[PDB]
Design a protein around this ligand. Structure first.
Ligand SMILES: NC(=O)C1=CN([C@@H]2O[C@H](COP(=O)(O)OP(=O)(O)OC[C@H]3O[C@@H](n4cnc5c(N)ncnc54)[C@H](OP(=O)(O)O)[C@@H]3O)[C@@H](O)[C@H]2O)C=CC1
Ligand SMILES: NC(=O)C1=CN([C@@H]2O[C@H](COP(=O)(O)OP(=O)(O)OC[C@H]3O[C@@H](n4cnc5c(N)ncnc54)[C@H](OP(=O)(O)O)[C@@H]3O)[C@@H](O)[C@H]2O)C=CC1
Ligand SMILES: NC(=O)C1=CN([C@@H]2O[C@H](COP(=O)(O)OP(=O)(O)OC[C@H]3O[C@@H](n4cnc5c(N)ncnc54)[C@H](OP(=O)(O)O)[C@@H]3O)[C@@H](O)[C@H]2O)C=CC1
Ligand SMILES: NC(=O)C1=CN([C@@H]2O[C@H](COP(=O)(O)OP(=O)(O)OC[C@H]3O[C@@H](n4cnc5c(N)ncnc54)[C@H](OP(=O)(O)O)[C@@H]3O)[C@@H](O)[C@H]2O)C=CC1
Lengths: 242, 242, 240, 240
């Protein structure tokens, strides 16, 4: 029972679902935010009855500010924000439309901005020695064919992590980033080249599990990581050189 | 006389002006693109009479495609694109409006996208073993207080460099990035803390010169750098650890 | 009943690692170089701790100890290569002897310990852990530390090479790089205030137990998909 | 009349650096270790070239040579620390002697040459250049190269430390890290096709002259604001 409040965007499926389950297990009050799938959210809240869930498009800043203000009033503060929501719109760069660029930009970048602005304003005004953990990707670090738009936003996320870490370090807020490689989710379940990935590209020869990303995020949110800030930790079975 | 064609966006002032002058000296036909200052462009073209100049907002994809198609018809191809145009809209993150985010995103990211898409389509279709050089910033690499939006776009630029390098490597197109630290321009001429920067933060104890960035960009565009691709080279007097 | 070996495990960061792994249920063996009194005082606090005086740059004495440890406990699950020395000074005033002394411990000590332990981990099919301690000095360079920063960059490189070489065996190999940590290695500094005020965004030195917490995480089964990485714990001081 | 010293300057990448700096108007001194025939054949091609046989791990012989060079030409403007060896093999089969041999040349050779040259550059107020050759093996790790990758990571770290230490003197110190370059060091590989097909996006090895072009740029007055950096020339093979 940590007596702490955490927001996990994209917190009902995939990596976000595992992060939610891990912080819940550690005794956080968790608020999980999602975009469309009411069924997954309700099913997750039936499994974890103390969880709050909200359908909220994080690219809509006015709805984000309203939701963060609501959460702040019910639980007296915000101790941890995990910016995990994200989308992909793959395609070769020469066939990738403006719309695929702006859709991914508006969620992976502007959604992190909306949540982080609203939450950090509260942490600063109340002098909460809080935590922000962003989820990026090896794609943003090393590049990935067919992912110019995704990789761009994930590189932006790492840079925002470092800038904000410097801006809020004097307020005792740490701001870090976690960059997974290939994780067994649905975002990677439609791949057919999984065997070539494991056999040739990943030294540990397997995909990561959602729970393994959650364990790292939970370490960074805990009081055992207060001297770590501005860092990008890569969880990828050894796949890339950071 | 290189008998090559180069486009330099933001090519009439500051770093872009120096890049223009250096490629012109090396015998490129240079097309310099700018945003508003007709006087600077005309004055630069009076100094370099073989230079082409165009007032073109690179965030406007239809005007970009029209201009790139024009340049392609007049000079039979494009050998080198330098994506140098960029803006800053500084402010502390908690007071930085959506508009400051989207203005910087639309030029530093979407402007690079529009130019690179139009130019790379031509290089691929004609099998030109061409060059793209993007201009980023130490701000994107290490973060900078008051520059969440700028730093985000400059990190995105580095990630796009790596993705596109991988996508076009088989076509013999190299795609690299140059990240200056503090360069003596007008973008840094309004600073009052310049002495503290030089005395304490920069080991070489001076700002860089525009021509020094241009010399690096010109090396990367030359035939002496065809085995370098996907890299980010930092020119900063030693200021940061990459 | 997992077995951990912590070199330099009786003072400073190593002591805190020993204490943390002890608290987490490991059988811990702490190796030290010369200070018998500190070692015995720690064994007083932690009665189940084994302590051995061993110069890790002596390959034969290292092999003897690792083989004895392995015979006694039936395996080795975790090696923390923490022992390290500094011999600082301007490059132009830094003798060959200051280079070789720091190389022989910070590089060859890691090599000797890791050769002995990994051979056993691989022979016994142990999905073990090696965690090496480097430094931000090796990542970003540091005036007056050409020799120290050389070996700490070497340690990071060795971590990455060994992670690739032993991945198929399920042995992860990671590195922790601290910034300024409050220990004896840093008690003599005169510029502590200026480092805190100007160089460290969090405006304080780290504590040894904060390094131990990160080491303990990497050693646990909650970190099995992290390998070959160097994680910096430095209050924001450097860009990795 | 600038003076450049290129260690290992008679074969492979070093030969191409010697040739490039010669073409650029330097007085070049090429240092080599044992192959007199190759050295004389290069001096035949480049009549103004000085060549010396010198084991750079011997500090006294290095000091003798640098002091002679300096007396003859009145200064030293550029040192390229290019000499290097590999003694590859699995970590568990890599003797102490393979570690020390590679350390003594790849680390201590750089140290001995750089101590001698930087002392003179600083004494004479020369705004000189040191360029060190590392490797992607040191950046990202490489199976079978624990010792080589150790020293190449050390070289990168030393570059950064020396860049900070000598910046106030106007001496820039940079590192070039090649990927796979067509030389004798790589002629014996059997997996060349698979490396080209799968690991190198540009699908070819680099040429020695492409490394020399980058070295020559860093040595020129067009690179005076670049210091402490490691520039990778590798066809896209790794992420830095
Ligand atoms: N999976 C992998 O292999 C890798 C993942 N990552 C990162 O991991 C994170 C999570 O990935 P993963 O678990 O696979 O993703 P999933 O696609 O499985 O889940 C995405 C979640 O984001 C929510 N979401 C999407 N758009 C919005 C929006 N506009 N506003 C609010 N919520 C939104 C979804 O809501 P809903 O359920 O209603 O649709 C869902 O809960 C991402 O940020 C991704 O970039 C990074 C590298 C690799
Ligand atoms: N200067 C420095 O210290 C640093 C610079 N950089 C990078 O260097 C690059 C150049 O910097 P610097 O020379 O100082 O910049 P300047 O502000 O001096 O020049 C910017 C140029 O960009 C053009 N431009 C701006 N917006 C657009 C647009 N929408 N479409 C087309 N052209 C446009 C301007 O046109 P016009 O002249 O008509 O206004 C001008 O020519 C930037 O990308 C910047 O991020 C990176 C790190 C530090
Ligand atoms: N403290 C800091 O700020 C930073 C530390 N580090 C790294 O952290 C590690 C620990 O540093 P710190 O705790 O400050 O060091 P201390 O000097 O406080 O402790 C060093 C320990 O290493 C042991 N040791 C030294 N040489 C040998 C040897 N040849 N064989 C066996 N044991 C040996 C010592 O034995 P004995 O007790 O008998 O002397 C002692 O237990 C080092 O690797 C260091 O480089 C990295 C960055 C910053
Ligand atoms: N080739 C590649 O693919 C890569 C190379 N590198 C680096 O590039 C550099 C050159 O490599 P490469 O050209 O392939 O090497 P070569 O083996 O082809 O050439 C080595 C040169 O170093 C000289 N040398 C060796 N030991 C000594 C010594 N103790 N004292 C003086 N000179 C010595 C040799 O002298 P002699 O001629 O008498 O034998 C020779 O001139 C090295 O630092 C290497 O690590 C890095 C990454 C990849």
């Amino acid at each position: 029972n940590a007596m702490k409040v955490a927001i996990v965007t994209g917190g009902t499926r995939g990596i976000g679902r595992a992060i939610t389950k891990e912080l819940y297990k550690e005794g956080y009050k968790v608020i999980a935010i999602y975009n469309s799938n009411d069924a997954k959210a309700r099913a997750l809240q039936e499994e974890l009855p103390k969880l709050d869930v909200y359908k909220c498009n994080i690219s809509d800043a006015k709805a984000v500010q309203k939701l963060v203000t609501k959460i702040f009033r019910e639980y007296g503060g915000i101790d941890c924000l995990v910016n995990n929501a994200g989308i992909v719109r793959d395609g070769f760069f020469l066939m990738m439309s403006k719309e695929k660029w702006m859709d991914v930009i508006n969620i992976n970048i502007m959604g992190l901005v909306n949540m982080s602005k609203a939450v950090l304003k509260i942490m600063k005004a109340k002098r909460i020695q809080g935590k922000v953990i962003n989820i990026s990707s090896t794609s943003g670090i090393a590049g990935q064919i067919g992912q110019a738009n995704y990789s761009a936003t994930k590189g932006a996320i790492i840079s925002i992590t470092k800038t904000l870490a410097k801006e809020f370090a004097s307020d005792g807020i740490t701001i870090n980033c976690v960059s997974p490689g290939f994780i067994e989710t649905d975002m990677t379940n439609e791949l057919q080249n999984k065997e070539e990935l494991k056999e040739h590209l990943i030294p540990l020869k397997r995909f990561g599990q959602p729970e393994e990303v959650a364990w790292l995020v939970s370490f960074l949110a805990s009081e055992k990581a207060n001297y770590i800030t501005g860092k990008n930790i890569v969880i990828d079975g050894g796949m890339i050189n950071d």
